[PDB]
Amino acid sequence: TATTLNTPVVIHATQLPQHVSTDEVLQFLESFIDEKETNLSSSISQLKRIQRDFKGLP
Amino acid sequence: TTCQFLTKAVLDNEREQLDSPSARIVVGKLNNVGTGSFDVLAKVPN
Amino acid sequence: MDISKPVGSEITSVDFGILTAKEIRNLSAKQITNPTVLDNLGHPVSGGLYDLALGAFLRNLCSTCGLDEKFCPGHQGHIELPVPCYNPLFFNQLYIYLRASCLFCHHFRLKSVEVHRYACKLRLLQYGLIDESYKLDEITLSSTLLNELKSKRSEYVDMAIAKALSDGRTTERGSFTATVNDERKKLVHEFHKKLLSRGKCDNCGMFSPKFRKDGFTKIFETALNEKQITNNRVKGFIRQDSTYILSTEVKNILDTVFRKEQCVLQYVFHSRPNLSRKLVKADSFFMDVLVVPPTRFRLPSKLGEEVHENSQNQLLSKVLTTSLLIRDLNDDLSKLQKDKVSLEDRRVIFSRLMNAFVTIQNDVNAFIDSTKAQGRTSGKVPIPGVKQALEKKEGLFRKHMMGKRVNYAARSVISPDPNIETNEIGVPPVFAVKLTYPEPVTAYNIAELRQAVINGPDKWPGATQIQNEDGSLVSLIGMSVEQRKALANQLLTPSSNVSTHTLNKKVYRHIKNRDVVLMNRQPTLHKASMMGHKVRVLPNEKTLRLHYANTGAYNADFDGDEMNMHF
Amino acid sequence: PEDFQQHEQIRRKTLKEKAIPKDQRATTPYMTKYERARILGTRALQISMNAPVFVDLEGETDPLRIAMKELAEKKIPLVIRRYLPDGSFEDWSVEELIVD
Amino acid sequence: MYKTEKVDLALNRNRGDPITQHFGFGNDEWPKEWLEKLDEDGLPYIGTYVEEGDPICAYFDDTLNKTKIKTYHSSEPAYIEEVNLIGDESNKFQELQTVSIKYRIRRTPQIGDKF
Amino acid sequence: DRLLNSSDYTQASVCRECGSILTTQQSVPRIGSISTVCCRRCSMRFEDAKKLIFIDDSQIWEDGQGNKFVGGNETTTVAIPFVLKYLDSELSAMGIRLRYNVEPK
Amino acid sequence: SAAMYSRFVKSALDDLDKNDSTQIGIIANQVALPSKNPERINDKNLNILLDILSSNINRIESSRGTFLIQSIINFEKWWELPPHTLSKYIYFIKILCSSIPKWWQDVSMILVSCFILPIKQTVCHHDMLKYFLRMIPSSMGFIDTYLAKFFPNKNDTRRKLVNYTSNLLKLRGYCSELGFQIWSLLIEKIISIDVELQNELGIKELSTKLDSILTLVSTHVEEQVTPESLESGEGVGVFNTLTTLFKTHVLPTYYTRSIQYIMFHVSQQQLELMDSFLVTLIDISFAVNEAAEKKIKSLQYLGSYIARAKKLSRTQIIFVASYLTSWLNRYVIEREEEVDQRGGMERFKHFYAAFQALCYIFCFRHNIFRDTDGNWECELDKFFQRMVISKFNPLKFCNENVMLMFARIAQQESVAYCFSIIENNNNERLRSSWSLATRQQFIDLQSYFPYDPLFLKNYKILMKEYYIEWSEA
Amino acid sequence: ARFIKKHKKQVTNPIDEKNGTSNCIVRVPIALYVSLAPMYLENPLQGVMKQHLNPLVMKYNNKVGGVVLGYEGLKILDADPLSKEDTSEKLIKITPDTPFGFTWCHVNLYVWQPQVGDVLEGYIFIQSASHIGLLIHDAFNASIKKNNIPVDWTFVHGHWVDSNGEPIDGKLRFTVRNVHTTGRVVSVDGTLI
Amino acid sequence: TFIRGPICGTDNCPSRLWRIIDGRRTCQYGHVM
Ligand SMILES: [Zn+2]
Ligand SMILES: [Zn+2]
Ligand SMILES: [Zn+2]
Ligand SMILES: [Zn+2]
């Protein structure tokens, strides 16, 4: 479970969230997936599935 | 005379700024004297 | 305290204030109503003082969090007082404002203009503006002039604070030094003296009946004197456009005065600017509920084999009985019409009510406070109330903060030794084998700590246990040499867990010559009676050995005097 | 939410204006006996938990001794923040302070 | 040094009450190492070395249906010197409830002793 | 160490919002969910909160008795001497409130 | 009955829309009973209750419905239900966790805990795990921790342990992404295997335990790793994670007898697996960053491996000899000058470490280093002598028993003559200095050989094809 | 007079074109106060990533009110307020009691924040008489309860059938009723009325 | 050293608690909590 070693003491948004186009979501997924190549493995796997959908696939 | 001074603090809606040695011992804060009179920071490259 | 459990949040200041009956009711885990504490099978009575909502008790689990007597922090509940009581802490201040009041126009009997002059000064002092508060008095150019005077003093205070904020001299949080605090305290004293110094109200010209007290918090009202009743009806046309007095009457009087005189009170009751913007209410001097502290602060005691009830519970249950009893008086009281109904019962109902109020007020006094309680059965000596527990004997501060009972460490008769260094202390193996530093295991010490763990609890220099990365301890006590050799070979295995990956194991070793302890001989009247010595373990010794060069510092004689060794 | 950000920036800015220009520093260029002890202890603590070490251990097993060695060669990556009584401060690197 | 301790298991009983606890052993299953310190009566053999935690007494408790044991408490080991059976008056009939055990502690003179 | 470590060092929960160390408790969760740390002062009884927008799931917690609460999730832990808790407790018996200002907010 | 019960429940649900909740609770309580109590709801009625609940699960997704659901998830030994009824329970659970993902947490926990049961009895559990891992990939988190939580203890029954690993292997084969964490768990059991066996080298217990576990693990790996599986498969994945866990657990702790034979054995499945291991060992034993003790442990591993691993090719061996003499020749050329300078012979731990490994390798495989001519590969005749007479005086600082055996063999082969240097060495001894505070750990480290013979009955037999006993060499 | 009501779902998520769904992917800048372990003293960004950020990926986070997809542009705020935002040497204050640092950081989060009211599309993966189970973006769980499906829709043995008697399949368009976030993984409650 | 009670706070027992005066409480395999 959560300790000061794996969890931020506090988190705050500094701005209102800005919506992003599909073309942007794709450019971000692209680079984030590349840069990060057990929990992280199974997660980029899922991201890989999402980027697949944003390109229209299965 | 604990309860007298306490009564006075409450009626003043006082804030204990926690600067005295006594106050800091009460709340478990590192003393303001001594090796505690400055901060240490690490110089990190890259 | 563990260097591998850091804390991110930090307390930076503490604010003093008063619990409102609304807060209490909201936070409460259970309303307590039963004087009886246990049943025939020793279980907590529901709605009683050991009710399990207030925390785990004995075997039982806490009904609020579900935790055991060990991990359950306890939770507070409340008692509902069927009738308002004066908070015994504040009764003197209540007395001052009550006496100062005009029961007719509901201002203080001190002329409004003066009261405003005090409000101006105190407000300036919240910002530390001492010079300005004297300049305020320099302001002068009958009721039309006065409001212009009030007004121009007011615009001076604003201009001064504005100016003070623009340059360095203050923040919106105020400025509070000793010289400021001194000026503030004088003014409040001066103000209170002037409040009580008035007879006729300076504002409406009427006389209010005088109020008198007890040392047991009862308030009497002395009816009006002859000249004064005459004076009062002469002013009768302008207004057209002894006895015990209940705490409820007193509260109503102050409630209104606090509304009217709110401005001044806003600064009399705040040494700093009141950013919170909360009104100053009369209720603050009264209690409609009592906070029942958590069960873990009210446990029974065992005097050897016999078990004794908690004294704070004995006091709280007396509040509880009186409470039920008043809730019954209140029940029969409503079953009047007496639209029919013959008057005199009015006198007897009052008699019973006075009785209830007095004795609950006594029980509260006794707790804050046994002082405020009527001495029992002439003898016995009073039982300490909460006030006396916090203040009793030498007090929490002296008995548990200045001084403490301590845990790791040792004590022994000292013996002289010319053959150790003047900065060492000769430690007997009997100590050396039981005292451990918690040593964190690293590349640089894995050899050493391996050996310690192999050596075990009983061969010096050894070890008594291992702390794992998940904080858990493993005892080396019951163990064979092989089991120990096994644990010694897994001291430095990698992490199989991301959450503890930053930690290493710890070995609770025996101490050694590399080490430093703190030696102490009492009385400790200067710092050299508590110094750091380098450890030197000496075979076959049963006492602490100390070089002569240190007697001076410790004031030690070697006549069977003892020292403490702290590790 | 936008303005708490602003509030923080003001706090942090004034703190630095206490914490001050390098070239306007005015306290002793010597490391104090207190600063030394804490620097040693704290650096020793970091060594005990696998901080990258900037010197040859040469068989040392006491992390305090390792720190002392690092101090001697001026390889301790720590900075002392000295507070003046109004809360403003001067940052001094361990390497730049004269040690004795 | 000699210390005398009084073991009196009539300490709880409410005055001339039925007797719950009697010196001796029950027939339930209990350690057996116990007989190293204790004779059949549940009293300790005279002369026995006794260190902290050892039995100095064994009785059978009725309300527990178990055989229990008063243990030796000093951190300083000792030997059993006298064991006195303090019988009761008020004419016999009553069984053993009170015992005095006198311990003997060796003092070869130690560091810190005063002369 | 002595006050610090011997003394009665204790990691304790505070509500960052009301500044109390006495009104926090562990939530009691449904099976499968994880317990969280909540403030009894700063949270509404579930009924009363409905009676005044949609209410998120993470914002509800329950005690052992079974009452549901909304809010009171602004808690952390601070290191205090245990005897502080006792003093605060005694003070609240006398109707007095200590309010600890914790940082970071 | 049949239709009476259909009414009873149908009523209960109406009564639940009204909040009376009694009828349901009566039912729930009836299903919650233990597998033993005769009064627990029987199959036929349960068939009914289930098929009715599945048909409109939304009727139950309420606070009032919680208790009923909890009672069905907690149905004892459900995997033990009769075919037809078992099927209705499964369909219900399927239906439940689909409309309400929340309960998947509760269902899977119980599932994992059933991993202590034999393979034949778990099909349904895996079928369900496979299903919901797919549809709720986010679950992998907490369900991974379950893998931790419910691992049988070392004390617990062997059948429990052997089962709970059999299942984890099965799980691995349809939820790859958990694959590493799994292998990490088994290995970290790892430490218990290290516990079992070295000290002993009850004990009869740990033998057959640790023996049943390893033989399993390795046979599953023999199947998981195959050329077909290596080009297009997850064979690669398994080797990788087993090699990683070797570098992080086996090597350091580095006094294990159970356990390093997993790598000994997988290694020798295919030529490249061997290649990868050798070069991997070489890396660790000569990397500039690593701690000297790590370099010494690797070098022991390296030497033991080359000596023992039967499936090694002449040239892979000559490869290691060629690396060692090469690295050694350089050491002496660049460093001999540092000996008569200030310091001790410990400055050269690493030199002796490597020279040991090479000597050791020569003991077991000297018959190979003679090429067709009868000449020595790597000029071993000329090379050994040079080191033996160097200023490092290896013979004095390396393991005593190896240096002795090397002497014997080397002398026999006209390769080198050390025996006078040895004489001189223990003469100078009776009458080149190293502390001995730290000199012992080295003697300790040089005494351990991670692939000296195994003492576990079965594993031994299994290893024979992959092992060279001293008698063989 | 009192506003705890600043935990009210303000998503707003816009409807799309050329399309009909709501775009719920959003980029939010955050500040976060985190610990830095001593092992990372030479790699502080690496350490902040491995300790704090990485564990946030593909989990719901109560503060950004959605699932965190990932992060860009991590920056440590130097405790030395006098340095330039440029320099690669920074100060991190060390705990009095422990060797751990604590610093503020700025980073950018990409968040999938489906609020109530939004229109989403899911891939049908399961059909009982009790609910329809969908997968949004082939990643997040959705579920339409039996009585959020319109009344004239019927069921068979199984698979659903609509208002006009034809079976439904694959992509389905629904509106967000509630978002459950406290379980192991996020789950969306959707409606068709 | 026995008291049987309090099983063991380690889910690979539960093996069987004796308390030492130092308050570790010790279970046979050798958890000290
Ligand atoms: Zn509790
Ligand atoms: Zn008046
Ligand atoms: Zn709160
Ligand atoms: Zn255990």
Curated annotation (Swiss-Prot), chain A:
Where does this protein have coiled-coil stretches? none
Subcellular localization: Nucleus, Nucleolus
Q: Which residues cross the membrane?
A: none
- PTM notes: The N-terminus is blocked.
Anything else the record notes? Present with 3100 molecules/cell in log phase SD medium.
What role does this protein play? DNA-dependent RNA polymerases catalyze the transcription of DNA into RNA using the four ribonucleoside triphosphates as substrates. Component of RNA polymerase I (Pol I) which synthesizes ribosomal RNA precursors. RPA14 seems to play a role in the stability of subunits RPO26 and RPA43. In vitro, the RPA14-RPA43 subcomplex binds single-stranded RNA.
How would you summarize the oligomeric state and partners of this protein? Answer: Component of the RNA polymerase I (Pol I) complex consisting of 14 subunits: RPA135, RPA190, RPC40, RPA14, RPB5, RPO26, RPA43, RPB8, RPA12, RPB10, RPC19, RPC10, RPA49 and RPA34. The complex is composed of a horseshoe-shaped core containing ten subunits (RPA135, RPA190, RPB5, RPO26, RPB8, RPB10, RPC10, RPA12, RPC19 and RPC40) where RPA135 and RPA190 form the DNA-binding cleft. Outside of the core, RPA14 and RPA43 form the stalk that mediates interactions with transcription initiation factors and newly synthesized RNA.
Q: What is this protein called?
A: DNA-directed RNA polymerase I subunit RPA14
Q: Which organism is it from?
A: Saccharomyces cerevisiae (strain ATCC 204508 / S288c)
From Swiss-Prot, chain B:
Superkingdom, according to UniProt?
Eukaryota
Give TM regions: none
Q: Which residues carry this modification: Phosphoserine?
A: 20
> Coiled coil located at which positions?
none
Q: Where in the cell is it found?
A: Nucleus, Nucleolus
Q: Which family does it belong to?
A: Belongs to the RNA polymerase beta' chain family.
Other information: Present with 2840 molecules/cell in log phase SD medium.
> How is the subunit organization of this protein annotated in UniProt?
Component of the RNA polymerase I (Pol I) complex consisting of 14 subunits: RPA135, RPA190, RPC40, RPA14, RPB5, RPO26, RPA43, RPB8, RPA12, RPB10, RPC19, RPC10, RPA49 and RPA34. The complex is composed of a horseshoe-shaped core containing ten subunits (RPA135, RPA190, RPB5, RPO26, RPB8, RPB10, RPC10, RPA12, RPC19 and RPC40) where RPA135 and RPA190 form the DNA-binding cleft. Outside of the core, RPA14 and RPA43 form the stalk that mediates interactions with transcription initiation factors and newly synthesized RNA.
Sum up the protein's function in the record's words: DNA-dependent RNA polymerases catalyze the transcription of DNA into RNA using the four ribonucleoside triphosphates as substrates. Component of RNA polymerase I (Pol I) which synthesizes ribosomal RNA precursors. Besides, RNA polymerase I has intrinsic RNA cleavage activity. RPA190 and RPA135 both contribute to the polymerase catalytic activity and together form the Pol I active center. In addition, subunit RPA12 contributes a catalytic zinc ribbon that is required for RNA cleavage by Pol I.
- Name used for this protein in its record: DNA-directed RNA polymerase I subunit RPA190
Swiss-Prot record, chain E:
Localization (cell)? Nucleus, Nucleolus
Q: Give the family per the record.
A: Belongs to the RNA polymerase beta chain family.
- What is the protein's quaternary organization? Component of the RNA polymerase I (Pol I) complex consisting of 14 subunits: RPA135, RPA190, RPC40, RPA14, RPB5, RPO26, RPA43, RPB8, RPA12, RPB10, RPC19, RPC10, RPA49 and RPA34. The complex is composed of a horseshoe-shaped core containing ten subunits (RPA135, RPA190, RPB5, RPO26, RPB8, RPB10, RPC10, RPA12, RPC19 and RPC40) where RPA135 and RPA190 form the DNA-binding cleft. Outside of the core, RPA14 and RPA43 form the stalk that mediates interactions with transcription initiation factors and newly synthesized RNA.
Q: State its role.
A: DNA-dependent RNA polymerases catalyze the transcription of DNA into RNA using the four ribonucleoside triphosphates as substrates. Component of RNA polymerase I (Pol I) which synthesizes ribosomal RNA precursors. Besides, RNA polymerase I has intrinsic RNA cleavage activity. RPA190 and RPA135 both contribute to the polymerase catalytic activity and together form the Pol I active center. In addition, subunit RPA12 contributes a catalytic zinc ribbon that is required for RNA cleavage by Pol I.
For this entry, the protein name equals DNA-directed RNA polymerase I subunit RPA135
This chain's source organism reads Saccharomyces cerevisiae (strain ATCC 204508 / S288c) (Baker's yeast)
What is the gene name? RPA135
Q: What part of the entire protein does this chain span?
A: 803 to 917 of 1203
UniProtKB/Swiss-Prot annotation, chain G:
Q: How does it assemble?
A: Monomer. Interacts with NOP53.
What protein am I looking at? RNA polymerase I-specific transcription initiation factor RRN3
* Location relative to the cell: Nucleus
**What does the similarity note say?**
Belongs to the RRN3 family.
Source organism of this protein record: Saccharomyces cerevisiae (strain ATCC 204508 / S288c)
Q: Pfam families, from UniProt?
A: RRN3
Q: Mind listing the UniProt keywords for this protein, alphabetically?
A: Nucleus, Transcription, Transcription regulation
Q: What else is known?
A: Present with 138 molecules/cell in log phase SD medium.
Q: Which domain of life is it from?
A: Eukaryota
Role noted for this protein: Required for efficient transcription initiation by RNA polymerase I. Interacts with Pol I in the absence of template DNA and stimulates recruitment of Pol I, but does not remain as part of stable preinitiation complex.
Annotated GO molecular function terms are:
rDNA binding; RNA polymerase I core binding; RNA polymerase I general transcription initiation factor activity; RNA polymerase I general transcription initiation factor binding
